[PDB]
Motif scaffolding. Structure first.
Motif, PDB file in Angstrom:
ATOM      1  N   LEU A  85      -5.619  12.420  -5.736  1.00 30.59           N
ATOM      2  CA  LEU A  85      -5.673  11.579  -4.541  1.00 30.59           C
ATOM      3  C   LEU A  85      -5.227  12.322  -3.278  1.00 30.59           C
ATOM      4  CD1 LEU A  85      -4.112   8.123  -5.588  1.00 30.59           C
ATOM      5  CD2 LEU A  85      -6.504   8.569  -5.112  1.00 30.59           C
ATOM      6  N   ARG A  86      -6.176  12.555  -2.385  1.00 38.04           N
ATOM      7  CA  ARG A  86      -5.878  13.240  -1.141  1.00 38.04           C
ATOM      8  C   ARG A  86      -5.713  12.186  -0.043  1.00 38.04           C
ATOM      9  NH1 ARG A  86     -10.927  15.336   1.121  1.00 38.04           N
ATOM     10  NH2 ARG A  86     -10.872  17.360   0.040  1.00 38.04           N
ATOM     11  N   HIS A  87      -4.856  12.477   0.931  1.00 35.78           N
ATOM     12  CA  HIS A  87      -4.632  11.578   2.051  1.00 35.78           C
ATOM     13  C   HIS A  87      -5.745  11.834   3.063  1.00 35.78           C
ATOM     14  CE1 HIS A  87      -3.143   9.435   5.375  1.00 35.78           C
ATOM     15  NE2 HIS A  87      -2.422  10.392   5.934  1.00 35.78           N
ATOM     16  N   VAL A  88      -6.599  10.831   3.274  1.00 35.25           N
ATOM     17  CA  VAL A  88      -7.733  10.964   4.189  1.00 35.25           C
ATOM     18  C   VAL A  88      -7.411  11.566   5.563  1.00 35.25           C
ATOM     19  CG1 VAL A  88      -9.442   9.720   5.530  1.00 35.25           C
ATOM     20  CG2 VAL A  88      -9.171   9.233   3.088  1.00 35.25           C
ATOM     21  N   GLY A  89      -8.286  12.465   6.009  1.00 36.75           N
ATOM     22  CA  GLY A  89      -8.081  13.118   7.289  1.00 36.75           C
ATOM     23  C   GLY A  89      -7.009  14.201   7.262  1.00 36.75           C
ATOM     24  N   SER A  90      -6.576  14.612   6.076  1.00 42.70           N
ATOM     25  CA  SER A  90      -5.569  15.657   5.970  1.00 42.70           C
ATOM     26  C   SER A  90      -5.930  16.512   4.775  1.00 42.70           C
ATOM     27  CB  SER A  90      -4.175  15.061   5.757  1.00 42.70           C
ATOM     28  OG  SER A  90      -4.033  14.540   4.449  1.00 42.70           O
TER      29      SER A  90
ATOM     30  N   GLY B 126      13.753  12.130  -5.303  1.00 41.42           N
ATOM     31  CA  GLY B 126      13.576  10.970  -4.447  1.00 41.42           C
ATOM     32  C   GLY B 126      12.242  10.254  -4.565  1.00 41.42           C
ATOM     33  N   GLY B 127      11.344  10.752  -5.410  1.00 40.97           N
ATOM     34  CA  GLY B 127      10.073  10.074  -5.576  1.00 40.97           C
ATOM     35  C   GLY B 127       8.847  10.864  -5.195  1.00 40.97           C
ATOM     36  N   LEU B 128       7.682  10.250  -5.368  1.00 38.85           N
ATOM     37  CA  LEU B 128       6.418  10.902  -5.054  1.00 38.85           C
ATOM     38  C   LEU B 128       6.348  11.231  -3.581  1.00 38.85           C
ATOM     39  CD1 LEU B 128       4.041   8.775  -7.327  1.00 38.85           C
ATOM     40  CD2 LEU B 128       5.659  10.677  -7.846  1.00 38.85           C
ATOM     41  N   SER B 129       5.643  12.307  -3.284  1.00 35.72           N
ATOM     42  CA  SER B 129       5.518  12.764  -1.918  1.00 35.72           C
ATOM     43  C   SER B 129       4.121  13.283  -1.677  1.00 35.72           C
ATOM     44  CB  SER B 129       6.524  13.883  -1.658  1.00 35.72           C
ATOM     45  OG  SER B 129       6.222  15.005  -2.463  1.00 35.72           O
ATOM     46  N   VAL B 130       3.891  13.730  -0.453  1.00 39.03           N
ATOM     47  CA  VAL B 130       2.599  14.263  -0.081  1.00 39.03           C
ATOM     48  C   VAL B 130       2.775  15.772   0.104  1.00 39.03           C
ATOM     49  CG1 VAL B 130       2.809  14.129   2.415  1.00 39.03           C
ATOM     50  CG2 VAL B 130       0.635  13.702   1.307  1.00 39.03           C
ATOM     51  N   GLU B 131       2.012  16.545  -0.652  1.00 34.87           N
ATOM     52  CA  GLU B 131       2.088  18.001  -0.606  1.00 34.87           C
ATOM     53  C   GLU B 131       0.712  18.505  -0.165  1.00 34.87           C
ATOM     54  OE1 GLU B 131       5.183  18.572  -0.787  1.00 34.87           O
ATOM     55  OE2 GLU B 131       5.730  19.147  -2.826  1.00 34.87           O
ATOM     56  N   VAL B 132       0.588  19.800   0.100  1.00 32.36           N
ATOM     57  CA  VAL B 132      -0.714  20.347   0.470  1.00 32.36           C
ATOM     58  C   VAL B 132      -1.481  20.496  -0.839  1.00 32.36           C
ATOM     59  CG1 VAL B 132       0.614  22.465   0.672  1.00 32.36           C
ATOM     60  CG2 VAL B 132      -1.854  22.541   0.988  1.00 32.36           C
ATOM     61  N   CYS B 133      -2.681  19.932  -0.883  1.00 27.46           N
ATOM     62  CA  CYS B 133      -3.497  19.958  -2.088  1.00 27.46           C
ATOM     63  C   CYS B 133      -3.575  21.330  -2.738  1.00 27.46           C
ATOM     64  CB  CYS B 133      -4.902  19.421  -1.795  1.00 27.46           C
ATOM     65  SG  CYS B 133      -4.906  17.711  -1.147  1.00 27.46           S
ATOM     66  N   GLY B 134      -3.331  21.359  -4.041  1.00 28.86           N
ATOM     67  CA  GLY B 134      -3.359  22.616  -4.753  1.00 28.86           C
ATOM     68  C   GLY B 134      -3.532  22.446  -6.243  1.00 28.86           C
ATOM     69  N   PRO B 135      -3.451  23.555  -6.989  1.00 26.55           N
ATOM     70  CA  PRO B 135      -3.592  23.622  -8.446  1.00 26.55           C
ATOM     71  C   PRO B 135      -2.541  22.870  -9.279  1.00 26.55           C
ATOM     72  CG  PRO B 135      -2.730  25.669  -7.602  1.00 26.55           C
ATOM     73  CD  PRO B 135      -3.243  24.900  -6.420  1.00 26.55           C
ATOM     74  N   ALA B 136      -1.338  22.704  -8.741  1.00 32.67           N
ATOM     75  CA  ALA B 136      -0.258  22.010  -9.443  1.00 32.67           C
ATOM     76  C   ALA B 136      -0.710  20.773 -10.236  1.00 32.67           C
ATOM     77  CB  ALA B 136       0.823  21.621  -8.443  1.00 32.67           C
ATOM     78  N   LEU B 137      -0.198  20.633 -11.460  1.00 32.29           N
ATOM     79  CA  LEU B 137      -0.561  19.499 -12.312  1.00 32.29           C
ATOM     80  C   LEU B 137       0.124  18.220 -11.871  1.00 32.29           C
ATOM     81  CD1 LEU B 137      -0.830  22.165 -13.805  1.00 32.29           C
ATOM     82  CD2 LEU B 137      -0.615  20.906 -15.980  1.00 32.29           C
TER      83      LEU B 137
ATOM     84  N   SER C 205      -4.121   4.117   9.340  1.00 26.36           N
ATOM     85  CA  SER C 205      -4.533   5.402   8.798  1.00 26.36           C
ATOM     86  C   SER C 205      -3.587   6.045   7.790  1.00 26.36           C
ATOM     87  CB  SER C 205      -4.796   6.382   9.940  1.00 26.36           C
ATOM     88  OG  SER C 205      -3.583   6.785  10.546  1.00 26.36           O
ATOM     89  N   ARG C 206      -2.301   5.712   7.853  1.00 27.15           N
ATOM     90  CA  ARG C 206      -1.361   6.303   6.906  1.00 27.15           C
ATOM     91  C   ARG C 206      -1.568   5.729   5.521  1.00 27.15           C
ATOM     92  NH1 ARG C 206       2.933   5.074   9.365  1.00 27.15           N
ATOM     93  NH2 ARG C 206       2.379   2.870   8.970  1.00 27.15           N
ATOM     94  N   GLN C 207      -2.474   4.764   5.406  1.00 26.81           N
ATOM     95  CA  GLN C 207      -2.717   4.130   4.126  1.00 26.81           C
ATOM     96  C   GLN C 207      -4.089   4.390   3.531  1.00 26.81           C
ATOM     97  OE1 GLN C 207      -1.741  -0.043   4.775  1.00 26.81           O
ATOM     98  NE2 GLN C 207       0.430   0.486   4.486  1.00 26.81           N
ATOM     99  N   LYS C 208      -4.770   5.407   4.035  1.00 30.51           N
ATOM    100  CA  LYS C 208      -6.091   5.719   3.527  1.00 30.51           C
ATOM    101  C   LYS C 208      -6.084   6.910   2.573  1.00 30.51           C
ATOM    102  CE  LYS C 208      -8.366   3.788   7.594  1.00 30.51           C
ATOM    103  NZ  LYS C 208      -8.740   2.558   6.816  1.00 30.51           N
ATOM    104  N   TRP C 209      -6.637   6.704   1.383  1.00 28.46           N
ATOM    105  CA  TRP C 209      -6.698   7.742   0.371  1.00 28.46           C
ATOM    106  C   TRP C 209      -8.120   7.913  -0.149  1.00 28.46           C
ATOM    107  CZ3 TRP C 209      -2.203  10.429  -0.904  1.00 28.46           C
ATOM    108  CH2 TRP C 209      -0.999   9.866  -0.440  1.00 28.46           C
TER     109      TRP C 209
ATOM    110  N   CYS D  11       0.789  -1.231   0.000  1.00 30.02           N
ATOM    111  CA  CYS D  11       0.000   0.000   0.000  1.00 30.02           C
ATOM    112  C   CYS D  11       0.824   1.286   0.000  1.00 30.02           C
ATOM    113  CB  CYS D  11      -0.914   0.011   1.229  1.00 30.02           C
ATOM    114  SG  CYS D  11      -2.427  -0.969   1.020  1.00 30.02           S
ATOM    115  N   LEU D  12       0.288   2.337  -0.609  1.00 28.70           N
ATOM    116  CA  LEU D  12       0.993   3.611  -0.591  1.00 28.70           C
ATOM    117  C   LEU D  12       0.772   4.123   0.829  1.00 28.70           C
ATOM    118  CD1 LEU D  12       0.013   5.211  -3.989  1.00 28.70           C
ATOM    119  CD2 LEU D  12       2.006   3.828  -3.406  1.00 28.70           C
ATOM    120  N   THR D  13       1.863   4.360   1.550  1.00 26.00           N
ATOM    121  CA  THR D  13       1.787   4.810   2.937  1.00 26.00           C
ATOM    122  C   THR D  13       2.291   6.243   3.144  1.00 26.00           C
ATOM    123  OG1 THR D  13       2.380   2.512   3.479  1.00 26.00           O
ATOM    124  CG2 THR D  13       2.299   4.063   5.319  1.00 26.00           C
TER     125      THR D  13
END
Ligand SMILES: O=c1ccn([C@@H]2O[C@H](COP(=O)(O)OP(=O)(O)O)[C@@H](O)[C@H]2O)c(=O)[nH]1
Ligand SMILES: [Mn+2]
Length: 489
Positions: A450-455, A467-478, A437-441, A415-417
């Motif tokens: 894809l937003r990380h649930v509860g965040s 270094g790879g995909l990461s989690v950023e604050v949801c925004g307009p970026a493509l 919970s770190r695995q809920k999308w 799972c993506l964590t």
């Protein structure tokens, strides 16, 4: 006898005498070739030294067409006459599907064996072939396009199969005829017809079993889940008994989906015979030569097929192709009854027994397939252990993921964590943990990210080169745009 003539005596000059527009392929170049131009023997050495039973049932060759290039049409007819045993060719029936010029088909009636039928109005390939099949007098049928070229002993290998088992719908390996220079090229004999959930023709590598059998017999015939073209041999009674063609389909679709499902689900089977070779002129973005096809499908015929044979599995097709839900496809009543009468098997049977290699999502998955962003695809990078994930340019496919009912995005049991929830933090591929919970999308903005649930964190590419995909604050970026190939939502 007095009105007929042998093909060598046919006056092709005059015929062709009276460049892409008219047929989407170089007509100018087509006309340069002689009606009987020679082509390379693209067969496997093994076929060459092989005997065929003389008692093979004769066949009726049905060629259907609508405004075809004269040179191509003619070259197809004599192709049959010259490349096959005269005694196995009861007749060549030409169904002129309402061409602007009656003469295109008319002038060929002069040739031995050729009988030509005409249509009051455009009827399309499905109806025309049915017309032909009825007018046919042989026990076995051979359907070919108005732009083909038969190779050495192409017919016997096909008749051998049907004689053995009336329920076998056999096709030759379809070679390619360049639409720009008409060079005759050979196709592989190690690929099967297949498809994806958007129901678009796809090539497949042979199965392990099939491979072993090829180790034994290098030219052994192989079963195929999806017919690859419109060239095939079939029993006349069996063709009718099974329901001929779906007379309600239109000029655009892939009537081939429907024909392949029905044969398989209703007892018969589909085979590709290596020793049989027939060249075909493929248009620009034909699915047989251009993966994924042109990327456009007037759904009518695809819906007609899906709605009649796929049972609940049609929803997967609709998940991959929402727009199709809003495409009219007419009455499929008599077809559903034909299925009833024939007591054909369900699709679940077909996926499990005929095309098991097609990965089918879980009934409770929310989204499934390749996770794409632009032309790039989410990929584990082969880091199957607490690894950083990234992306590769998609392969036209590749790596599949699932947005499960439990709100996870997994690849098998990984799972993506969201290891660390601070912006910029790289995500990691880990063993899925039921309630972790770190695995809920969750998908947002019309299944476009894809937003990380509860965040308020979204999956992002920005850091891919760092270094790879990461989690950023949801925004307009493509780099926050993600799309599953199919969404059951
Ligand atoms: O009886 C026929 C035979 C061919 N066509 C039209 O001719 C084109 C090429 O037909 P074919 O089956 O060869 O399609 P292809 O294999 O090139 O895609 C299409 O526009 C067909 O729908 C038709 O309308 N009626
Ligand atoms: Mn064709």
């Amino acid at each position: 006898d007095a009105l007929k003539v042998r093909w060598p005596d046919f006056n092709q000059e005059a015929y062709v005498g009276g460049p892409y527009a008219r047929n989407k392929f170089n007509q100018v170049e087509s006309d340069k070739l002689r009606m009987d131009r020679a082509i390379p023997d693209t067969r496997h050495d093994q076929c060459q030294r092989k005997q065929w039973r003389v008692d093979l049932p004769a066949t009726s060759v049905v060629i259907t067409f609508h405004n075809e290039a004269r040179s191509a049409l003619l070259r197809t007819v004599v192709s049959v006459l010259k490349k096959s045993p005269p005694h196995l060719i009861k007749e060549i029936i030409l169904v002129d599907d309402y061409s602007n010029d009656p003469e295109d088909g008319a002038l060929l009636g002069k040739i031995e064996k050729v009988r030509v039928l005409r249509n009051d109005r455009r009827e399309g390939l499905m109806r025309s072939r049915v017309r032909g099949a009825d007018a046919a007098q042989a026990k076995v049928l051979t359907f070919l396009d108005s732009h083909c070229e038969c190779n050495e002993h192409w017919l016997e290998p096909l008749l051998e199969r049907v004689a053995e088992d009336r329920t076998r719908v056999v096709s030759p390996i379809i070679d390619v005829i360049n639409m720009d220079n008409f060079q005759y090229v050979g196709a592989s004999a190690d690929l099967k017809g297949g498809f994806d959930w958007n129901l678009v023709f796809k090539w497949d590598y042979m199965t392990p079993e099939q491979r072993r059998s090829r180790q034994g017999n290098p030219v052994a015939p192989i079963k195929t889940p999806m017919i690859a073209g419109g060239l095939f041999v079939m029993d006349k009674f069996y063709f009718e008994e099974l329901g001929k063609y779906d007379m309600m389909m239109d000029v655009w679709g892939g009537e081939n989906l429907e024909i392949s499902f029905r044969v398989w689900q209703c007892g018969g089977s589909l085979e590709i015979i290596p020793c049989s070779r027939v060249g075909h002129v493929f248009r620009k973005q034909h699915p047989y030569t251009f993966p994924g096809g042109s990327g456009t499908v007037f759904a009518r015929n695809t819906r007609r097929a899906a709605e009649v044979w796929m049972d609940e599995y049609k929803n997967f097709y609709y998940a991959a192709v929402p727009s199709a839900r809003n495409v009219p496809y007419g009455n499929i009543q008599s077809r559903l009854e034909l299925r009833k009468k024939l007591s054909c098997k369900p699709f679940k049977w077909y996926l499990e027994n005929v095309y098991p290699e097609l990965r089918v999502p879980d009934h409770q998955d929310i989204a499934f397939g390749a996770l794409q962003q632009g032309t790039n695809c989410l990929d584990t990078l082969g880091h199957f252990a607490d690894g950083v994930v990234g992306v590769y340019e998609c392969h036209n496919g590749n790596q599949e993921w699932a947005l499960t009912k439990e709100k996870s995005v997994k690849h098998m049991d990984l799972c993506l964590t969201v290891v660390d929830r601070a912006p910029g933090s790289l995500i990691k591929l880990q063993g899925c943990r039921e309630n972790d919970s770190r695995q809920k999308w969750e998908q947002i903005e019309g299944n476009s990210k894809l937003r990380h649930v509860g965040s308020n964190l979204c999956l992002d590419s920005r850091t891919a080169k760092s270094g790879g995909l990461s989690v950023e604050v949801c925004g307009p970026a493509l780099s926050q745009q993600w799309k599953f190939t199919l969404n059951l939502q």
